[PDB]
Design a binder for this molecule. Structure first.
Ligand SMILES: *[C@@H]1O[C@H](CO)[C@@H](O[C@@H]2O[C@H](CO)[C@@H](O[C@@H]3O[C@H](CO[C@H]4O[C@H](CO)[C@@H](O)[C@H](O)[C@@H]4O)[C@@H](O)[C@H](O[C@H]4O[C@H](CO)[C@@H](O)[C@H](O)[C@@H]4O)[C@@H]3O)[C@H](O)[C@H]2NC(C)=O)[C@H](O)[C@H]1NC(C)=O
Ligand SMILES: *[C@@H]1O[C@H](CO)[C@@H](O[C@@H]2O[C@H](CO)[C@@H](O)[C@H](O)[C@H]2NC(C)=O)[C@H](O)[C@H]1NC(C)=O
Ligand SMILES: *[C@@H]1O[C@H](CO)[C@@H](O[C@@H]2O[C@H](CO)[C@@H](O)[C@H](O)[C@H]2NC(C)=O)[C@H](O)[C@H]1NC(C)=O
Ligand SMILES: *[C@@H]1O[C@H](CO)[C@@H](O)[C@H](O)[C@H]1NC(C)=O
Ligand SMILES: *[C@@H]1O[C@H](CO)[C@@H](O)[C@H](O)[C@H]1NC(C)=O
Ligand SMILES: *[C@@H]1O[C@H](CO)[C@@H](O)[C@H](O)[C@H]1NC(C)=O
Lengths: 473, 101
């Protein structure tokens, strides 16, 4: 009556600390055991194993090692080649299999003993498709990283069949992590609207290679597929005027939810990040927030089921588990406002296709919530008729315009004086009188800067390149 | 006691037998296509089905020998995007106009 043993299969690192998903699995069980309100008479016990995340025969050993030892649930080996092997074990023996990451589920896989707390890309691909219609785009440039990313965005690729989009699908390079040959082809083709399908470890890597090129301007709009845009250390891109947009399921508005994330930073003291990683220092990823929710959703199901005795099964002798079909129905019929918001399941598949996103975007202050997505509501983008707040902070009517010009009598001259100190004041003439009375009417500030070539404008035939002031424009 | 295992011929089942045949040493001869992930460090397998790194380049040669500009690629299941990813990336460099259904 005192133990309900859960099973865990996690990444084996060789020298570093515990993984982000494993430490959340530790922190979730220790929270429920201390706070005696939830499960007042049962105390949870964890049994974590280590695999290589690419060895489906090693992951099939650790699943049978936990079934012979006796567990009640197995919380995922978190990879597409390894989770398919453990799912068919958990479907056979009866024990539920709680997944916290996305997996390509084939159409004829007749499995029922699994749930997935990661949001389905049948809903996330419809949410990205609502942002390419709220922003009224016509040409997108969807960029992924591996070949599985076409399945994650197949409701976006099929969009020109019915809407007026024009897809140009590209791919990041496989071996290297230098996207300079990719981003140069995107600048040259005039592609200002990009949808990156990356992880947040590679999303910070592209933006340092998009800042080293001239692509972090006020023209470019970037929509990111990942749910960890909020973990980017966006200090240098903050004043550029770039239009970074993305989603967020991690409910960082509640006081109770934000208190748990602050306690998460007090458990990762010995973890110095890279200074050139481009990420923040103390935060919870959405890969570890779902594992914190995955322990709580199952703990709701053991609250409504007190006769639960953990049995010991054998893989070679195929015997189903006694309380398998009843305990699995209690997991799919659950509701829990965890760290990732409202949690409910598809009830036909076991997937998660009903959730609450928060559309975030990059402003001068940083990332701010500018919307809310909900599958049977569409985008509730606030955006409103107010829009920008009360007045213009640190009034942008300066924005000092670097008015280029050339000197020619009597349009632009040098002033004939003896005192030496000048700068945008040594000029006089006709155009300087004109520019001074356009700044009086429109209310801007101007800083005269002569062209350093001394030409007006010319189409150089042997080069196809401009020559003069229109080159500076 | 066997010497070779000639495939269970499905993407969810062949990945489980490949990691057994990689472990024990016995070769694993595959006769159908399978999505092989990039970080699968396996060596004891061969695949006699033609790769779609070559078949997708052969279909791309017939949409240029026939001089097309608008194709309407139709698949049946979500794995078929991986089988034709060298055809979907074609408007990035050529003058095709994909409409995927
Ligand atoms: C999980 O549970 C969900 C709901 O809880 C079940 O329904 C799936 O999810 C959505 C429901 O809205 C479906 O996606 C939508 O499909 C619409 C098509 O309508 C019908 O058309 C086919 C063809 O005849 C029918 O067979 C089928 O029953 C569909 O119901 C589209 O019109 C929708 O497009 C737009 O919808 C709204 C409109 O404002 C927007 O908010 C959207 O962003 C979008 O632009 C939308 O595509 C989904 O297709 C349903 N699944 C299935 C299989 O039909 C599911 O049963 C359940 N399982 C899964 C895997 O989702
Ligand atoms: C980048 O973000 C700013 C935020 O205000 C966008 O500014 C306005 O966007 C609306 C469309 O949603 C336009 O109708 C306004 O004219 C914009 N005001 C400006 C530019 O002063 C801006 O458009 C965004 N850049 C894009 C989408 O390329
Ligand atoms: C969409 O708009 C807001 C969120 O953007 C939703 O919430 C409403 O906000 C207004 C302004 O403070 C309140 O007066 C309402 O009481 C809020 N409604 C709630 C909390 O239910 C609003 O409901 C949404 N409208 C829809 C979905 O039609
Ligand atoms: C334990 O968690 C619940 C929420 O599930 C909360 O209401 C309660 O206050 C917590 N216990 C303590 C002692 O704070
Ligand atoms: C655990 O506690 C609840 C409430 O205190 C009680 O109703 C339940 O019967 C207890 N479980 C047992 C005794 O197994
Ligand atoms: C104009 O706005 C404020 C003055 O209110 C000033 O501090 C700011 O630097 C100016 N902006 C420019 C020059 O771009």
């Amino acid at each position: 009556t005192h133990v309900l043993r859960f099973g865990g299969i996690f990444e084996y690192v060789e020298s570093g600390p515990m993984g982000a998903e494993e430490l959340a699995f530790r922190f979730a069980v220790n929270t429920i055991n201390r706070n005696r309100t939830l499960l007042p008479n049962t105390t949870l016990t964890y049994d974590t194993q280590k695999i290589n995340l690419y060895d489906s025969f090693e992951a099939s050993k650790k699943a049978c090692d936990q079934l012979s030892l006796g567990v009640a649930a197995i919380f995922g080996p978190s990879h597409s080649s390894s989770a398919n092997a453990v799912q068919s074990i958990c479907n056979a023996l009866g024990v539920p299999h709680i997944q916290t990451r996305w997996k390509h589920q084939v159409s004829d896989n007749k499995d029922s003993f699994y749930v997935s707390l990661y949001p389905d890309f049948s809903s996330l691909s419809r949410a990205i498709l609502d942002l390419v219609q709220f922003f009224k785009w016509k040409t997108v440039t969807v960029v992924y990283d591996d070949s599985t990313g076409l399945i994650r965005l197949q409701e976006l690729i099929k969009a020109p069949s019915r809407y007026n989009l024009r897809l140009k699908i590209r791919q990041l390079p496989a071996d290297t992590k230098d996207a300079k040959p990719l981003l140069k082809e995107m600048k040259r083709g005039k592609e200002f609207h990009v949808i990156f399908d990356c992880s947040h470890e590679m999303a910070a890597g592209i933006l340092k290679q998009a800042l080293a090129m001239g692509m972090m301007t006020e023209y470019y709009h970037y929509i990111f597929t990942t749910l960890d845009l909020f973990a980017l250390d966006v200090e240098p891109y903050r004043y550029s005027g770039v239009n970074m947009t993305g989603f967020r399921i991690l409910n960082t508005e509640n006081t109770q939810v934000s208190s748990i994330i602050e306690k998460w930073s007090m458990e990762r003291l010995q973890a110095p990040p890279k200074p050139d990683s481009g990420l923040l220092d103390g935060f919870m990823t959405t890969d570890a927030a779902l594992m914190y929710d995955a322990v709580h959703v199952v703990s709701v199901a053991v609250q409504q089921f007190p006769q639960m005795t953990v049995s010991s099964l054998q893989c070679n002798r195929h015997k189903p588990w006694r309380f398998g079909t009843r305990f699995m129905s209690l997991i799919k019929e659950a509701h829990w406002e965890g760290l990732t918001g409202r949690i409910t399941f598809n009830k036909t598949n076991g997937l998660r296709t009903d959730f609450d996103l928060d559309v975030i975007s990059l402003k001068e202050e940083g990332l701010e919530k500018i919307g809310t997505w909900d599958p049977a509501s569409g985008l509730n983008m606030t955006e409103s008729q107010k829009g920008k707040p009360a007045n213009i902070t640190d009034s942008l009517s300066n924005r000092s315009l670097i008015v280029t010009t050339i000197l020619e009598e009597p349009y632009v001259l040098f002033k004939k004086s003896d005192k030496p100190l000048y700068g945008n004041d040594r000029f006089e003439g006709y155009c300087i009188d004109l520019l001074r009375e356009l700044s009086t009417i429109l209310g801007f500030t101007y800083e005269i800067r002569l062209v350093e070539d001394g030409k007006y404008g010319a189409q150089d035939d042997v080069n196809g390149q401009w020559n003069g002031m229109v080159r500076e424009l």
